[PDB]
């Protein structure tokens, strides 16, 4: 018997198929997070600015209180 190269089929590798698929973000869903992060962003930032006003008047008060300076 003579032995040569043998053939293999099984699944035939599956040639030409789109492996690319959309993931995580769809379109409308990411905009709700996007503007949602903005709405949370400005609201939390301005609370510290109002807290800065408590310091702002009190810091400049030191110059008014000190006249022997």
């Amino acid at each position: 018997x003579x032995x040569x190269x043998x053939x293999x089929x099984x699944x035939x590798x599956x040639x030409x198929x789109x492996x690319x698929x959309x993931x995580x973000x769809x379109g409308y869903s990411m905009f709700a997070v996007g503007i949602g992060a903005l709405l949370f962003g400005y609201w939390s930032m301005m609370k510290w600015n109002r807290e800065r006003r408590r310091l702002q008047i009190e810091d400049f008060e030191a110059r008014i209180a000190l006249m022997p300076l």
């Binding site: 993931x23 973000x25 769809x26 379109g27 409308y28 990411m30 905009f31």
Partner: protein, 59 residues
């Protein structure tokens, strides 16, 4: 046989236009491209250093 490279505009109305506009306004697909090489960093490199390891050959 003809495979055709032209897509002939995937966008049409409302839902198909806005998601195609969202990827061009910010990024999304570029962050998806950023994540492609992320997994490539995680997997081990197929590298052979010569003075100790040797490469594959034939009889």
């Amino acid at each position: 046989t003809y495979k055709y490279v032209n897509l002939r505009e995937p966008s049409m109305d409302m839902k198909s236009v806005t998601d195609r506009a969202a990827q061009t306004l910010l990024w999304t697909e570029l962050i998806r491209g950023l994540g492609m090489t992320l997994s490539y960093l995680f997997r081990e490199p197929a590298t052979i250093n010569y003075p100790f390891e040797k490469g594959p050959l034939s009889p």
